[PDB]
Amino acid sequence: SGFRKMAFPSGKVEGCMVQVICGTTTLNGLWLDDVVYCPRHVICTSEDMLNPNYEDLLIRKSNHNFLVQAGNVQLRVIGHSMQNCVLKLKVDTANPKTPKYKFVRIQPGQTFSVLACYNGSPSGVYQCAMRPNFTIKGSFLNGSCGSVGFNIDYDCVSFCYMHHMELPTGVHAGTDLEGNFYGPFVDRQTAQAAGTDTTITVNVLAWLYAAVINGDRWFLNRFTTTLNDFNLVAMKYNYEPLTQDHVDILGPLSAQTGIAVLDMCASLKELLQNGMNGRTILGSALLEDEFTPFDVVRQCSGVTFQ
Amino acid sequence: SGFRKMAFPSGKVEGCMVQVICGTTTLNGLWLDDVVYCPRHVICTSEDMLNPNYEDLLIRKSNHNFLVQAGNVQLRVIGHSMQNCVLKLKVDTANPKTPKYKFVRIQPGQTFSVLACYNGSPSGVYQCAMRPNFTIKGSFLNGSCGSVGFNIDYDCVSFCYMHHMELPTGVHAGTDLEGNFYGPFVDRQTAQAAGTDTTITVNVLAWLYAAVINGDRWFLNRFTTTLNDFNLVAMKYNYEPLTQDHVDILGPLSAQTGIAVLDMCASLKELLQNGMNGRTILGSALLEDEFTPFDVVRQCSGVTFQ
Ligand SMILES: *C(=N)[C@H](C[C@@H]1CCNC1=O)NC(=O)[C@@H]1[C@@H]2[C@H](CN1C(=O)[C@@H](NC(=O)C(F)(F)F)C(C)(C)C)C2(C)C
Ligand SMILES: *C(=N)[C@H](C[C@@H]1CCNC1=O)NC(=O)[C@@H]1[C@@H]2[C@H](CN1C(=O)[C@@H](NC(=O)C(F)(F)F)C(C)(C)C)C2(C)C
Ligand SMILES: CCN(CC)CC(=O)Nc1c(C)cccc1C
Ligand SMILES: CCN(CC)CC(=O)Nc1c(C)cccc1C
């Protein structure tokens, strides 16, 4: 029993992290086969970042302007190109630690692990969700850019995020590994703000199932509801609408616990209308929305990885 | 900015996890040099666990009764012994992935990362604190025993916990790597219960400093207090006493923020007497006590590891 915010084991990703230095700017890169991927603003001075023309800045660089450090070994850059907001540095050595991997673009509400790195070295690992407003609530300092987010499937690492920037309220924005930002943000140091965020309803329901699996059952009422009736109430409280796809995704947890999804929706509706009355669920005084249905199954059923 | 419950990167520990099978019982072992460490109840049938005589059960086993699987390779057991609640299996191959390591016994209030494993394979990583009542609030299922807790120091893995059992309320108990339990628990399936837990005051103060570093400052009052006056109030609310050692440990965060430890104690005292008035700190509606002063420094300053 017990339920914690759990990250994937990080070893496969640790083997891919390198340091990328361009002049004086230093950040992290991801070394897969003979390519190192990193944020393009590694080519910027502090002044350039205020209003960069990345195409112009990259013109002015040759392969020799990039230093890649992998442990005690320097890797020679023998080609470079830009793909959206990511720089791809071809190096003279393919990484012998390259895991089976994919590049994926995730949907809002999906979760992933972040290996927070500085100077090519890992600092720590934590779990994040892609928020509906296309930010993540991470923990990142200067030099963290190029840290990646990922999921594991048996032996395959699905990279879904590369870190680029921090927005007001201290939330974070970045790209997929093709360099395309999540959300309407740009890699320029000028005032930008995330839109109003919303609560990921399907994930809250997943976490209520996790609570029931763990014996935290006080919030279960005797009611049911229609999907339409639930959604009008949740829209009031800045919850995302629940779709039939979400209901279908919750099926395995519903069958395990013997609680129909619409019955759990009625329980959630009561929590939204009445509050928690000074009680906790799984040790939290707030409803938690950063566990997906699969996260609950993976953790409560002991799914392992190679 | 941002502040998350962060685990250490797990790769060095992943390289040490193996499967130990004794007859039909299967759990995890820790492979370091030519020794595999695992919980002694691997030698128990389900019936034995109700009231085991481990010395008698181990008599009856030979080296051939233990199978150790490390990836696709089976390791021959060529010796065995018992050290308190841990079994040590000498194998014919030293682990080439053995990191620099130490065995340490931690104090209540200290934190560590857990690599939760099943069948020798990692499932996930999360951060835990040793509670004042010598339990940890983990997430563990059948077959998780032998999963370890650890801290990293540059390149050195300090192993501090091996998982053995779950107690009522769904909290967890285990041993150091010499097999000595934390707390007054025994590895027998009979009714046991943790004593009343308390809140780790020095860690709450560390987390309030983390909040201030992140700009969450609404709870800072204009008062100071003596250490004695603070401790009488906190004792009322089941908080551990704050010692001069704790004050000294908080010094670096106090100096960084320019907030005297006793001033932050006055702020905490007000939160305990008045509550949070429907507000959050670092996104939490409850005061958090599972970040140590070093955890706050490591995360907010970007300390990395080899
Ligand atoms: C990569 N190493 C850093 C990570 C930042 C640093 C502080 N917390 C983080 O996550 N990325 C940056 O410093 C980027 C980078 C220029 C400026 N920047 C920012 O994150 C800034 N944010 C913005 O300008 C805003 F609001 F638009 F997001 C900063 C004020 C430094 C937080 C570039 C090229 C965007
Ligand atoms: C190791 N693989 C498991 C981990 C357990 C399983 C459920 N959650 C966990 O953390 N260890 C055990 O099953 C141990 C083991 C016998 C029984 N046991 C327990 O954890 C039981 N707890 C107790 O008997 C109590 F209350 F004393 F802690 C159980 C009822 C199965 C939760 C031995 C040898 C102690
Ligand atoms: C790059 C796109 N992927 C899609 C799965 C191919 C791949 O990962 N191949 C791969 C395999 C099969 C074993 C070990 C290492 C690698 C890199
Ligand atoms: C076992 C007790 N430790 C105390 C630090 C010795 C140690 O870890 N030695 C070690 C070194 C120095 C480098 C690589 C691997 C190992 C095992």
**Is B302's CB within 8 Å of A143's CB?**
yes
Which residues are registered as beta bridge partners of A113? A127, A150
Which of A4, A19, A279 has the most B C-beta neighbours within 10 Å, making it the best mutation to test the interface with B? A4
The crossing angle, in degrees rounded to 10, of helices A293-301 and A201-213 is: 20
Pairing of strands B121-129, B111-118: antiparallel
Instruction: Walk me through the domains of chain B, giving residue ranges and CATH numbers.
Output: 15-91 (2.40.10.10), 201-301 (1.10.1840.10)
Task: In whole angstroms, give the CA distance from residue A260 to residue A276.
Answer: 21
List residues of B with catalytic annotation: 41, 145
What CA–CA distance (Å, rounded) separates B161 from B198?
Answer: 20
Tell me the two tokens of residue A78.
């023998």
Instruction: Measure CB to CB from residue A7 to each of B124, B137, B215 and give the nearest one.
Output: B124
How many angstroms separate the alpha carbon of residue B291 from the centre of ligand 3? 38
* Angstrom distance (rounded) from CA A157 to CA A15: 12
Beta-ladder partners of B90:
B35, B79
Interface contacts (A, B; CB < 8 Å):
156
The ligand minimizing its distance to the Cα of B15 is 4
Residue A216 CA to residue A114 CA, distance in Å, equals 29
Beta bridge partners of A118: A121
Residue with tokens 């972040």: A114
- Which of B172, B109, B126 lies closest to B4, judged by CA? B126
Please provide residue B253's backbone torsions phi and psi, each rounded to the nearest 5 degrees: -70, -35
Please report the atom of ligand 2 found closest to the CA of residue B187.
35
- Residue B59 corresponds to which tokens in the numbers above? 């008599």
DSSP secondary structure letters along chain A: ------BPP-HHHHTTEEEEEETTEEEEEEEETTEEEEEGGGG--TTGGGS--HHHHHHT--GGGEEEEETTEEE-EEEEEEETTEEEEEESS--TTPPEEEE--PPTT-EEEEEEEETTEEEEEEEEE--TTS-B-----TT-TT-EEEEEETTEEEEEEEEEEEETTTEEEEE-TTSPBSSS--SSSS--------B-HHHHHHHHHHHHHTT--TT--S----HHHHHHHHHHTTBPPPPHHHHHHTHHHHHHHT--HHHHHHHHHHHHHH--TT--BTTBSS------HHHHHHHHHT----
Does the beta carbon of A145 sit less than 6 angstroms from any atom of ligand 1? Answer: yes
3-state secondary structure A75-119: ECEEEEEEECCEEEEEECCCCCCCCEEEECCCCCCCEEEEEEEEC
Q: List the beta bridge partners of residue B86.
A: B39, B83
- A271 Cβ partners below 8 Å, 6+ apart? A219, A287
Query: What tokens appear for A93 in the block?
Result: 């050595």
Q: How far apart are CA B251 and CA A201, in angstroms?
A: 42
Q: Among residues A44, A85, A128, A145, which one is catalytic?
A: A145
The DSSP code for B204 is: H
| Mutational pocket test of ligand 4: of B13, B37, B95, B100, the residue with most ligand atoms within 8 Å of the beta carbon | B100
Cα separations in angstroms, B6 against B82, B139, B191, B275: 34, 16, 33, 27
A57, A59, A83, B22, B44 from A51: Cα distances, Å: 11, 16, 19, 64, 67
Q: Residue A227: phi, psi to the nearest 5?
A: -60, -40
Counting beta carbons within 10 angstroms of the beta carbon of residue B90, is it exposed (0 to 12), middle (13 to 18) or buried (19 or more)?
middle
Residue B242 DSSP code: P
Give the span between the Cα atoms of A47 and A45, in whole angstroms.
5
What's the resolution in A? 1.6
Task: Say if ligand 1 is within 6 A of residue A143 CB.
Answer: yes
What are φ and ψ of residue B161, in 5° steps?
A: -145, 140
How far are the Cα atoms of A201, A270, A278, A280 from residue A275, in angstroms, in the given order?
16, 8, 8, 11
Q: Return the biggest CA–CA distance within chain A.
A: 69
CB-CB neighbors (< 8 A) of A299 in chain B: 123-124, 139
Q: Which ligand is nearest to the CA of A141?
A: 1
**3-state SS of chain B: helix, strand, coil percent to 5?**
25, 30, 45
Contact map slice: A 133-162 vs B, CB within 8 A: 137-144
Measured between CB atoms, does B97 come within 8 Å of chain A?
A: no
With beta carbons less than 8 A apart as the criterion, state whether B91 and B35 touch: yes
Strand partners, A171: A167
End-to-end CA distance of chain A: 23
Residue pair A246/A227 in contact by the 8 Å Cβ criterion: no
Contact A152, A8 (CB under 8 A): yes
Between the alpha carbon of residue A189 and those of residues A47, A60, B13, the distances in Å are 9, 21, 39
By alpha-carbon position, which residue is closest to atom 13 of ligand 2?
Answer: B165
* Residue B295 and residue A296 in contact, taking contact as beta carbons nearer than 8 Å: no
Please, what is the end-to-end C-alpha distance for chain B in angstroms?
23
Contact status, residue B208 vs residue B289, Cβ threshold 8 Å: no
Could you tell me how many helices (H) and strands (E) chain B has, helices first? 8, 13
**Given CB atoms, is A279 within the 8 Å cutoff of chain B?**
no
The ligand 4 atom at the shortest distance from the C-alpha of residue B33 is 17
In Å, how far are A19, A97, A142, A145, B221 from A69, measured between CA atoms? Answer: 5, 15, 19, 16, 47
How many whole angstroms separate alpha carbon A256 and alpha carbon B274? 42
Resolved by:
X-ray
Test B166 with A284 for CB contact under 8 angstroms.
no
Chain B residue with the nearest C-alpha to that of A123: B304
Q: How far is the CA of B231 from the centre of ligand 4 (A)?
A: 42
d(CA B197, CA B132): 6
Which of A21, A161, A165, A167 is the pocket-test mutation for ligand 1 (most atoms within 8 Å of CB)? A165
Q: Which residues pair with B126 in a beta bridge?
A: B114
- Whole-Å CA distances, B247 to A285, B225, B250: 29, 13, 5
Alpha carbon A222 to chain centroid, angstroms:
36
Distance of CA A57 to the CA centre of its chain: 29
